[PDB]
């Protein structure tokens, strides 16, 4: 049972929940690999034991372990896979699984919200236009005129033999990335690959550096079909600074809804390769990562010239001063537009109280230090001084190969 | 079957074949990762010694020679007669450098080859220990043009007690308990301050009182030694455009000299081997002055800046912190005391990683310690994956001798 200490206060807890960790990660007693983004790389008898475990913990969570429909439900899944080779999840189970996969996401700092999550069942789906209308319901409900609401929608589970639903965009909302005559990029260099595929499936390109991409949606077996998104459904925030009058003239924008559409949900031994989820942004994800990373929009040097900073010596900390203003402008702009957003101080303080909750509930909580600590002002937030344990519980979201 | 390591800012790919030779185990398993934890006989003394000797004779491109096999046969028969062996002077210098080279949480390692090793293995007493330390401080400080140095006191040996420096650093500030239960001075140093007092020291009452040295000779109580003030170079902190900053009274010292770690070379253990370099500015500005459990000046700075401290979304903490760091960098540059900022430091470490891949095929690095505590993703180390493992020779934590 790992002893975990908080170095700001001195408190000590023990992770007894780690002792129930399954899917072995990447580390060994000889070498630690916690800093790798993708750990490693990417006869149905094992379906039973994964469904048995998941159903067992479903009934513990609602008191009904021992007697009643608990043992009963064990038999239906036994007979359903003995007949068909897969099984269908009940509605409450799909909702309980979805929430647990969020609760178990080691790198998510927003997990204090894990209990409030709207789960749209789309297992009826069987068409590309069908999912496109499913996706537009999610976005509409999730955006909610800017008072954002956590949502996931679950499309039909992978079946042995015959194909899979797959959203080809990594997010539902993503900006174009076109290569110049220079080979350099106008737009988001993160999305130069998917922009390449959008065009070669009949998309006509656009203006420049803030073009919303179309959704490449893939019904089983048949190829991907492009789907344009209505501008009305894509809520965006133009970026302005509360006191730097020129920042708005830089013409920077970002969208409201972070909605990840390329991860695979796994509940009770069933894989849902199309299950896009969405929450709201932490300000540093936009300001520091999306806009300041050297391989993203790389705006930091441009904002520093406008602030008339000394970009000729790193010891002037001009990068640090420029970044903070970019984060200030993001927070101000989203707030001015009444769009839900959270600063990294508020967000990490909530994660600490999530840790304390999860200590009482389950005796621990899987957490990935490097992704919990903000990308600016790390040691100024409480999680910096908090030791953490990372391990992999099910249900979970996993990374998955891309369909090409 | 070696770890694939990716740099995300650029797209580089390399593999860490040096990890496979890792000669110790750490706290991680396939079941769970503990990377974020701060604190993670003859035949085995002989097998460590052989790996070191092999390392040394490799570095002087003399592997597998007669001079090589001689020294192997030599140390083996010395362990037989006495249970231990002695390093030659060149072997000691190489081992101290390798320990620095192998230190996984050190961002200043691009320098590892430039190290001044002082051989104090003939030291006989605490008084003499004091003299060797004062000279270390004088040479490393060098009137503000700092030099990397290490002093190596006698090794652990059967029959006698260890030399120990009780102080965690050669220069530290007193931490005095209050009547509010509060702490005047540095709260990290409240215990060593109590220790010093009960061993005879007359305490002050400032917030930047330099502590005496508690020095332990074999089988003796610790003895108290005052550092002559003119040996301890200090830098008063001011801000270049915030003139009220000087009225805080804040200071920090030139020389970071860590004195409580253990140096291991070829199975030998040196429990007293203080080493020193020069500060990276975030250690002073961010950690030592802004940690809530350290001097904790952040809120008082931000109020003086007229920042809005009612709400976190004004980012008052980030703004005050960046200006506390600007003051540190400016104050040291004004006082002509060596200092590196986290941007230059992390850029040099990137060069170290590339040097190390070509040289040894990888490099042990602790990402959570290499990435600076402010402006992380603005530096190039944030976007570099790293492999953490324990190589020997090495520095190691050891328990407090009290
Ligand atoms: C409600 C507000 C939320 C916030 C502020 C938030 C924030 C974050 C942040 C900051 C990361 C780090 C990733 C990065 O920065 O690169 C992350 C990762 C992640 N989030 Fe959350 N998130 C929220 C809601 C959700 C929801 C609703 C889900 C799913 C139902 C979710 C699941 C995940 C997963 C699966 C990952 C990464 C996979 C892994 O860590 O292994 N989050 N989130
Ligand atoms: C000359 C410039 C140097 C710089 C800028 C530097 C910087 C650093 C920093 C910032 C840390 C992490 C401290 C923290 O934030 O808690 C560190 C750790 C460390 N450094 Fe360096 N250092 C320098 C020289 C040296 C020298 C000369 C030695 C030894 C001869 C050394 C050995 C170590 C060790 C042992 C650690 C702890 C590593 C671990 O526990 O894995 N450093 N250094
Ligand atoms: C690049 C390999 C994987 O990276 C990842 C992996 C995951 C997420 C991610 C996923 C969901 C989020 C939600 C719901 C809200 C939010 N506020 N943020 C999120 C961030 C970002 C990245 C970007 N690095
Ligand atoms: C308490 C767990 C271990 O912490 C540690 C561990 C090590 C060092 C350390 C050691 C040597 C340094 C040198 C030579 C120069 C410099 N510029 N910095 C240093 C920092 C600081 C801390 C502070 N936390
Ligand atoms: C190399 C390093 O592990 C990698 O760049 C990680 C570090 N921490 C991160 N943390 C968050 N939140 N998002 C990221 O993309 C990363 N990247
Ligand atoms: C809990 C946490 O891992 C711990 O406080 C570490 C994090 N990384 C660090 N990194 C450096 N360089 N110095 C530190 O003191 C710490 N503290
Ligand atoms: Cl994003
Ligand atoms: Cl220090
Ligand atoms: Gd101007
Ligand atoms: Gd001024
Ligand atoms: Zn690990």
mmCIF file of C-alpha atoms in Angstrom, chain A residues 2-4 7-8 18-19 21 24-25 27-38 41 288-289 293-295 300 314-317 319-321 323-325 327-328 331 335 343-346 369-370 375-380 384-385 387-391, chain B residues 1 3-4 8-9 19-20 22 24-26 28-39 286-287 291-293 298 312-315 317-319 321-323 325-326 329 333 341-344 367-368 373-378 382-383 385-389:
data_model
loop_
_atom_site.group_PDB
_atom_site.id
_atom_site.type_symbol
_atom_site.label_atom_id
_atom_site.label_comp_id
_atom_site.label_asym_id
_atom_site.label_seq_id
_atom_site.Cartn_x
_atom_site.Cartn_y
_atom_site.Cartn_z
ATOM 1 C CA UNK A 2 1.874 3.116 -1.271
ATOM 2 C CA UNK A 3 2.499 5.881 1.270
ATOM 3 C CA UNK A 4 1.658 9.222 -0.386
ATOM 4 C CA UNK A 7 4.681 18.321 1.153
ATOM 5 C CA UNK A 8 2.850 21.643 1.650
ATOM 6 C CA UNK A 18 -4.025 0.947 -6.299
ATOM 7 C CA UNK A 19 -3.942 -2.668 -5.111
ATOM 8 C CA UNK A 21 -5.182 -2.009 -10.592
ATOM 9 C CA UNK A 24 -0.334 -3.092 -16.441
ATOM 10 C CA UNK A 25 1.152 0.207 -17.528
ATOM 11 C CA UNK A 27 6.903 1.202 -15.729
ATOM 12 C CA UNK A 28 9.297 -1.402 -14.291
ATOM 13 C CA UNK A 29 11.543 -1.418 -11.178
ATOM 14 C CA UNK A 30 14.499 -0.637 -13.485
ATOM 15 C CA UNK A 31 13.142 2.412 -15.367
ATOM 16 C CA UNK A 32 10.228 4.825 -14.958
ATOM 17 C CA UNK A 33 8.278 5.783 -18.111
ATOM 18 C CA UNK A 34 5.555 7.956 -16.589
ATOM 19 C CA UNK A 35 6.401 10.874 -18.879
ATOM 20 C CA UNK A 36 5.576 9.093 -22.155
ATOM 21 C CA UNK A 37 2.336 10.326 -23.721
ATOM 22 C CA UNK A 38 1.272 6.955 -25.161
ATOM 23 C CA UNK A 41 1.787 1.221 -28.066
ATOM 24 C CA UNK A 288 -0.679 28.261 -22.900
ATOM 25 C CA UNK A 289 -0.861 25.073 -24.956
ATOM 26 C CA UNK A 293 3.336 25.920 -27.961
ATOM 27 C CA UNK A 294 6.090 26.234 -30.594
ATOM 28 C CA UNK A 295 4.352 23.619 -32.761
ATOM 29 C CA UNK A 300 4.161 34.145 -27.946
ATOM 30 C CA UNK A 314 15.732 35.258 -21.964
ATOM 31 C CA UNK A 315 16.580 36.751 -18.531
ATOM 32 C CA UNK A 316 13.951 39.470 -19.099
ATOM 33 C CA UNK A 317 11.432 36.597 -18.750
ATOM 34 C CA UNK A 319 8.038 34.675 -22.555
ATOM 35 C CA UNK A 320 6.681 34.435 -19.013
ATOM 36 C CA UNK A 321 5.141 37.913 -19.084
ATOM 37 C CA UNK A 323 2.115 34.016 -21.627
ATOM 38 C CA UNK A 324 0.375 35.395 -18.539
ATOM 39 C CA UNK A 325 -1.325 38.115 -20.581
ATOM 40 C CA UNK A 327 -4.011 33.576 -20.311
ATOM 41 C CA UNK A 328 -5.552 36.750 -18.907
ATOM 42 C CA UNK A 331 -10.169 34.180 -19.200
ATOM 43 C CA UNK A 335 -16.111 35.449 -19.280
ATOM 44 C CA UNK A 343 -8.644 29.081 -14.393
ATOM 45 C CA UNK A 344 -5.892 26.652 -13.378
ATOM 46 C CA UNK A 345 -5.866 27.799 -9.727
ATOM 47 C CA UNK A 346 -9.591 27.216 -9.184
ATOM 48 C CA UNK A 369 1.286 14.156 -11.815
ATOM 49 C CA UNK A 370 2.631 15.560 -15.092
ATOM 50 C CA UNK A 375 1.643 24.060 -17.762
ATOM 51 C CA UNK A 376 2.263 27.457 -16.185
ATOM 52 C CA UNK A 377 2.661 28.350 -12.507
ATOM 53 C CA UNK A 378 2.937 24.673 -11.414
ATOM 54 C CA UNK A 379 4.404 25.193 -7.954
ATOM 55 C CA UNK A 380 1.909 27.992 -7.267
ATOM 56 C CA UNK A 384 2.489 20.433 -7.295
ATOM 57 C CA UNK A 385 3.376 19.528 -3.702
ATOM 58 C CA UNK A 387 2.522 13.082 -4.346
ATOM 59 C CA UNK A 388 0.322 10.984 -6.651
ATOM 60 C CA UNK A 389 -0.075 7.378 -7.778
ATOM 61 C CA UNK A 390 -0.850 6.481 -11.395
ATOM 62 C CA UNK A 391 -2.437 3.151 -12.355
ATOM 63 C CA UNK B 1 13.447 -3.906 -26.533
ATOM 64 C CA UNK B 3 12.218 2.494 -24.476
ATOM 65 C CA UNK B 4 11.210 4.675 -27.419
ATOM 66 C CA UNK B 8 6.842 16.494 -29.189
ATOM 67 C CA UNK B 9 7.909 20.052 -30.072
ATOM 68 C CA UNK B 19 18.441 2.351 -19.265
ATOM 69 C CA UNK B 20 18.895 -1.391 -19.752
ATOM 70 C CA UNK B 22 20.407 0.356 -14.723
ATOM 71 C CA UNK B 24 19.440 -0.418 -9.081
ATOM 72 C CA UNK B 25 15.698 -0.809 -8.735
ATOM 73 C CA UNK B 26 13.248 1.972 -7.967
ATOM 74 C CA UNK B 28 7.649 1.617 -9.891
ATOM 75 C CA UNK B 29 6.014 -1.613 -11.046
ATOM 76 C CA UNK B 30 3.797 -2.430 -14.038
ATOM 77 C CA UNK B 31 0.904 -2.186 -11.552
ATOM 78 C CA UNK B 32 1.431 1.424 -10.519
ATOM 79 C CA UNK B 33 3.795 4.353 -11.126
ATOM 80 C CA UNK B 34 5.450 6.184 -8.196
ATOM 81 C CA UNK B 35 7.580 8.566 -10.255
ATOM 82 C CA UNK B 36 6.306 11.584 -8.301
ATOM 83 C CA UNK B 37 7.537 10.435 -4.883
ATOM 84 C CA UNK B 38 10.216 12.764 -3.529
ATOM 85 C CA UNK B 39 11.967 9.920 -1.648
ATOM 86 C CA UNK B 286 9.494 30.521 -7.139
ATOM 87 C CA UNK B 287 10.349 27.857 -4.573
ATOM 88 C CA UNK B 291 6.176 28.235 -1.509
ATOM 89 C CA UNK B 292 3.389 28.658 1.104
ATOM 90 C CA UNK B 293 5.537 26.708 3.593
ATOM 91 C CA UNK B 298 3.611 35.950 -2.794
ATOM 92 C CA UNK B 312 -7.912 33.724 -8.811
ATOM 93 C CA UNK B 313 -8.907 34.435 -12.424
ATOM 94 C CA UNK B 314 -7.045 37.743 -12.413
ATOM 95 C CA UNK B 315 -3.951 35.477 -12.232
ATOM 96 C CA UNK B 317 -0.361 34.706 -8.299
ATOM 97 C CA UNK B 318 1.249 34.259 -11.711
ATOM 98 C CA UNK B 319 1.969 37.994 -12.158
ATOM 99 C CA UNK B 321 5.604 35.288 -9.161
ATOM 100 C CA UNK B 322 7.014 36.431 -12.505
ATOM 101 C CA UNK B 323 8.050 39.739 -10.962
ATOM 102 C CA UNK B 325 11.774 36.030 -10.421
ATOM 103 C CA UNK B 326 12.677 39.187 -12.422
ATOM 104 C CA UNK B 329 17.722 37.670 -11.859
ATOM 105 C CA UNK B 333 23.267 40.304 -12.211
ATOM 106 C CA UNK B 341 17.351 31.539 -15.757
ATOM 107 C CA UNK B 342 15.088 28.558 -16.433
ATOM 108 C CA UNK B 343 15.014 29.300 -20.171
ATOM 109 C CA UNK B 344 18.799 29.176 -20.658
ATOM 110 C CA UNK B 367 10.740 15.021 -15.907
ATOM 111 C CA UNK B 368 8.864 16.395 -12.885
ATOM 112 C CA UNK B 373 8.174 25.160 -11.408
ATOM 113 C CA UNK B 374 6.938 28.136 -13.462
ATOM 114 C CA UNK B 375 6.440 28.502 -17.220
ATOM 115 C CA UNK B 376 6.911 24.749 -17.759
ATOM 116 C CA UNK B 377 5.605 24.378 -21.297
ATOM 117 C CA UNK B 378 7.418 27.533 -22.380
ATOM 118 C CA UNK B 382 8.280 20.050 -21.138
ATOM 119 C CA UNK B 383 7.810 18.559 -24.623
ATOM 120 C CA UNK B 385 9.737 12.500 -22.923
ATOM 121 C CA UNK B 386 12.295 11.187 -20.429
ATOM 122 C CA UNK B 387 13.336 7.853 -18.880
ATOM 123 C CA UNK B 388 14.176 7.858 -15.172
ATOM 124 C CA UNK B 389 16.569 5.239 -13.758
#
